[PDB]
Amino acid sequence: LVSGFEATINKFDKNFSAHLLDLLARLSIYSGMASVISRLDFNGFYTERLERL
Amino acid sequence: REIITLQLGQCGNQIGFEFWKQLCAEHGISPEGIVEEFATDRKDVFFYQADDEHYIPRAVLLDLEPRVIHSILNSPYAKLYNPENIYLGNNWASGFSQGEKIHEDIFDIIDREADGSDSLEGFVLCHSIAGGTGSGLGSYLLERLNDRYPKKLVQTYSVFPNQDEDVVVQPYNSLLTLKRLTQNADCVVVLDNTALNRIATDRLHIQNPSFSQINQLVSTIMSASTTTLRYPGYMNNDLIGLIASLIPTPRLHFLMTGYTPLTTDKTTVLDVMRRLLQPKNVMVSTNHCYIAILNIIQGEVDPTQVHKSLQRIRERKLANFIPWGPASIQVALSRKSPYLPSAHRVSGLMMANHTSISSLFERTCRQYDKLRKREAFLEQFRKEDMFKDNFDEMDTSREIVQQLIDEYHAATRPDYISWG
Amino acid sequence: REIITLQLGQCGNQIGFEFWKQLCAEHGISPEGIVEEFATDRKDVFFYQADDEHYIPRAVLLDLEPRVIHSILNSPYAKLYNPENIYLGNNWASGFSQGEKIHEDIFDIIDREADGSDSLEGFVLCHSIAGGTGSGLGSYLLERLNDRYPKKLVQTYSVFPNQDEDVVVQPYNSLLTLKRLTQNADCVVVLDNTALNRIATDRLHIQNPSFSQINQLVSTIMSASTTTLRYPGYMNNDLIGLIASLIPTPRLHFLMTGYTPLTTDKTTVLDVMRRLLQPKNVMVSTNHCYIAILNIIQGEVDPTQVHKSLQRIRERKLANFIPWGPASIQVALSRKSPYLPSAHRVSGLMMANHTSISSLFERTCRQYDKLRKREAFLEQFRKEDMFKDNFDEMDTSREIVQQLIDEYHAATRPDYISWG
Amino acid sequence: YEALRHFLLMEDGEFAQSLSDLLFEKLPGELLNPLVLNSVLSKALQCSLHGDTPHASNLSLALKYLPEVPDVLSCLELRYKVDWPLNIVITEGCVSKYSGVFSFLLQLKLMMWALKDVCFHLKRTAMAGSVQFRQLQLFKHEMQHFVKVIQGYIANQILHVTWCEFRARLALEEIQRAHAEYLHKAVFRGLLTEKAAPVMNVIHSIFSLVLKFRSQLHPNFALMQQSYNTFKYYSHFLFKVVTKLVNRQPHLEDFLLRINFNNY
């Protein structure tokens, strides 16, 4: 029930969030333009998770 | 897919009548259903197409002990709604028991429009909570429709009655409805008779003929909530893809309303979003917070202005979400129709999931708890007692709606990741 | 932050009426409230912004048993002031006791504008000292407002009555007011009926209709005292930076008025700075000395002239002072509005903290001391006796105002570093 | 010119009083990435209530130094940007001296925010009426008036008298020379020149003492009393050092008049 499902849930949720970090952080090095980060990272959500370097 | 609307009860038949009349005027439809000679819209979903351009809407009108429905029949628009589907107490139990005997013929009336359409996605109910005949029958029909159509989804344009608190069994009736809706309604849009009345006293001097004038206030919301479906666009060209953003968790499917020009009788998009977030434009009467907000604007809107407006609203912070999720304000755009007045050239509406509506659920729950301790109106009528000897469906309704209140406040809590 | 003005009493409602009418003329406003067609200023602070540009003032009008208050209502400007916030004896105790029963609804009237604005900095009271209904009620409201709103800063445009000394209980009323104002007013701007009357005899031949014309003099002072807030500036755009230089110690918060062209109906800044330091233009009737002086000039001022003029005023030494404070005269500059006439385009006002206002406080104190020895008008009315059986708030007021008089003369002394 | 004055020289109110007010709310690794300082300007132009034009863009809020960690210094630039047929007149060395005067004006804004914070911080303390309260608040009034008169000097010279010239002076080479004179009078009257530099050196002592006064927001009264006495000594020294530099500049003639009015 959960042995086959929640195992696929957490490994996908961690893989989603990591690639969601890498989309935001690689778009944040791009200094209109930087607003795609701050739209995705609206009012306090996921705008400070892991600072690169 | 095409939408069939199940307007029921006297109040619900009133608002469905006015809703289809306003779509008659807004679209290119005459009172006889004929295409207008003076007339770019997606009329397929809401209006059935006859060969002589009789745009008859897929309205299902249910009359139980009919009075208002006779007045509905002697109208100039009686030729417009002709799918020939009108089939002949103030208690919830009386309405339920009266619906049970005629369920098969009213369901065959559902089946005929389901066969006659190419396809069907949703059942949009003009439901009246605690509406005497409308309440009870609407809960029973709501319970039948999800069983018969399990893939399909049901919306409820609930007119939640708050009239400063005549029906003495109104909290009991409303209590049973909200249990049936919480388990058996995919979506609910909430409206309030007190809030529409306070807005009536605000924008006009109307106090005594409150219902007749609030019908127009309800109908403007009901049209603007569907305009992005009724007219094409880039996005939100399906009900269900609109619905998913407004309802993030299945238990909290209740949606508040608002309109930027309440007096809709140039304004930039920054101005109309800021005006919408203020509480005077909201039509609904511990920390509390939104779960997700959406907005739709119709009119002469500059396109690059709306992203600067989203940035501007983000800096204004007039409403702050703070749920467990990434929910953001979502800008959407539609076209204002021709042939009707373009007054207030830019004009908008919002739909949102807010935890403040749980206080309103708790108000009729508090009235019910006091009335349930008193037992002043158990009604003891032989319909009421023979239908519920145990009177325990009220207690199941109380525990289900108490779960709903606790779920709302748990959504306010930082941990809705755990079970609410 | 936006300023809400609490005009109260008959005389205070008169001067607030004329103040907002003058700001309607001077800004781009019409008697309906909407902006005129012909109209770069900061109208945000003083005027609320409606959706259709109905710049409505945030005026709170309080009336008490209204008979002549309806004259404010049958005006062309009644649509201009529409926040709908007007809620229904000649003794201080009568006004206090009448205010106590309606304090909650008038405070809810305060709360509504408090929520409706973006923000609030100050409550500016058009108060009438010893004004029958205005006195007493104004002292009670002034006592409530600092408790409820401690962060905000209160100003009082006190029209101190001196009419060559009809109210026989006028020193008692004024005595109680000044205790409340010294304790619960962050700043007070003082004005004198006899000084404006002597100015009226000077500039014109008007003697019998003194109040109706002195309204215009008071309104010119009241407008020019806030012109640097109402119109944009490099400095002192907030009210707090203006207030702090004028009021150096919290007890002495009373401010003198004067205007450079005693008839305003070219002049260099050497001349218009010189004219403020002449006593004929001052609007107020042992060594004595200013504590700090400030001036604001209007129009297209030539500015190297203000180097020359500040050095010239220093060499002239027309203003004599040596207080504990540093007391440098500060010069300010503002723009004359682009609507009103350009005749006498250069036009200036002064606000200053002067120890000579202590003599005026002592005058009504001397009248009170004589009347208190005589006990000729203790009034003995059952309101006055039941409210004040001990009659010891008059003695508490007397010791507080006597502290104020002694503080003023200690401010004249070289040692106000020690306790005054 | 009348737009760069609105933004760089801080003439337009509700913009400097919002940008500086937003930046001073924070005070290292934070306040230096382009997520907050490159966005605080897009937050501040919104509450300007004057601008949002094509001129109002090209306000690159950049930095020029990485601070490590009570002082009166926070280095930060604010550069305008132009296009081709205007870059030939407004030189690229002129906007650098605009930054040079801008840092001083923002440093002046720091005083009227922090002293406002100690004026507001004492307001919540108010019953507590004694010796140690009123004799303390007299120091705030004594120290505020100095900042409020030196700022009025700056606000008369660099924004009004040097703007009457170069506005009634204009009405192709003369545009270059007239701009190079307008700025040069703006930085000459601003006490930023190396000729009158000791006069500027005393202002840092004054400003640092007011910052130390903001630090002690009556457990440590005498520690603040000594600081006030040092303030009074330094102001009394400034009045002599400005008077000795009268014999050797008519721009400084206003300053002795500003600081001294019925005193010595």
Curated annotation (Swiss-Prot), chain A:
Tissue: Ubiquitously expressed.
Compartments where located: Cytoplasm, Cytoskeleton, Microtubule organizing center, Centrosome
Domain of life assignment: Eukaryota
Function: Component of the gamma-tubulin ring complex (gTuRC) which mediates microtubule nucleation. The gTuRC regulates the minus-end nucleation of alpha-beta tubulin heterodimers that grow into microtubule protafilaments, a critical step in centrosome duplication and spindle formation. Plays a role in neuronal migration.
Disease tied to this protein: Cortical dysplasia, complex, with other brain malformations 15: An autosomal recessive disorder characterized by global developmental delay, variably impaired intellectual development, speech delay, facial dysmorphism, microcephaly, and varying degrees of cortical malformations including pachygyria, thin corpus callosum and subcortical band heterotopia. Most patients have generalized seizures.
Subunit structure: Component of the gamma-tubulin ring complex (gTuRC) consisting of TUBGCP2, TUBGCP3, TUBGCP4, TUBGCP5 and TUBGCP6 and gamma-tubulin TUBG1 or TUBG2. TUBGCP2, TUBGCP3, TUBGCP4, TUBGCP5 and TUBGCP6 assemble in a 5:5:2:1:1 stoichiometry; each is associated with a gamma-tubulin, thereby arranging 14 gamma-tubulins in a helical manner. Gamma-tubulin at the first position is blocked by TUBGCP3 at the last position, allowing 13 protafilaments to grow into a microtubule.
Annotated family: Belongs to the TUBGCP family.
UniProt protein name: Gamma-tubulin complex component 2
Annotated source species: Homo sapiens
Gene for this chain: TUBGCP2
First and last residues shown, out of full length: 814 to 872 of 902
From Swiss-Prot, chains B, C:
Chief location category: cytoplasm
Keywords: Cytoplasm, Cytoskeleton, Disease variant, GTP-binding, Lissencephaly, Microtubule, Nucleotide-binding, Phosphoprotein
GO biological process: cytoplasmic microtubule organization; meiotic spindle organization; microtubule cytoskeleton organization; microtubule nucleation; mitotic cell cycle; mitotic sister chromatid segregation; mitotic spindle organization
UniProt cross-references to InterPro entries, sorted A to Z: Gamma_tubulin, Tub_FtsZ_C, Tubulin, Tubulin/FtsZ-like_C, Tubulin/FtsZ_2-layer-sand-dom, Tubulin/FtsZ_GTPase_sf, Tubulin_C, Tubulin_CS
Location in or out of the cell: Cytoplasm, Cytoskeleton, Microtubule organizing center, Centrosome; Cytoplasm, Cytoskeleton, Spindle
Binding positions for GTP per the UniProt entry: 130-136
CDD domains found in the cross-reference section: gamma_tubulin (cd02188)
Assembly behavior: Component of the gamma-tubulin ring complex (gTuRC) consisting of TUBGCP2, TUBGCP3, TUBGCP4, TUBGCP5 and TUBGCP6 and gamma-tubulin TUBG1 or TUBG2. TUBGCP2, TUBGCP3, TUBGCP4, TUBGCP5 and TUBGCP6 assemble in a 5:5:2:1:1 stoichiometry; each is associated with a gamma-tubulin, thereby arranging 14 gamma-tubulins in a helical manner. Gamma-tubulin at the first position is blocked by TUBGCP3 at the last position, allowing 13 protafilaments to grow into a microtubule.
Descriptive protein name: Tubulin gamma-1 chain
Gene name for this UniProt entry: TUBG1
Swiss-Prot record, chain D:
Subcellular location: Cytoplasm, Cytoskeleton, Microtubule organizing center, Centrosome
Superkingdom classification of source: Eukaryota
Annotated family: Belongs to the TUBGCP family.
Disease: Microcephaly and chorioretinopathy, autosomal recessive, 1: A syndrome characterized by microcephaly, cognitive impairment, underdeveloped retina and choroid, and epilepsy in some patients. The more anterior parts of the retina, near the periphery and pars plana, have a grayish hue and diminutive vasculature similar to retinopathy of prematurity. Visual impairment becomes evident during the first year of life.
Function: Component of the gamma-tubulin ring complex (gTuRC) which mediates microtubule nucleation. The gTuRC regulates the minus-end nucleation of alpha-beta tubulin heterodimers that grow into microtubule protafilaments, a critical step in centrosome duplication and spindle formation.
Complexes and interactors: Component of the gamma-tubulin ring complex (gTuRC) consisting of TUBGCP2, TUBGCP3, TUBGCP4, TUBGCP5 and TUBGCP6 and gamma-tubulin TUBG1 or TUBG2. TUBGCP2, TUBGCP3, TUBGCP4, TUBGCP5 and TUBGCP6 assemble in a 5:5:2:1:1 stoichiometry; each is associated with a gamma-tubulin, thereby arranging 14 gamma-tubulins in a helical manner. Gamma-tubulin at the first position is blocked by TUBGCP3 at the last position, allowing 13 protafilaments to grow into a microtubule.
Protein's name according to its UniProt entry: Gamma-tubulin complex component 6
Parent-record interval covered: 1517 to 1815 of 1819
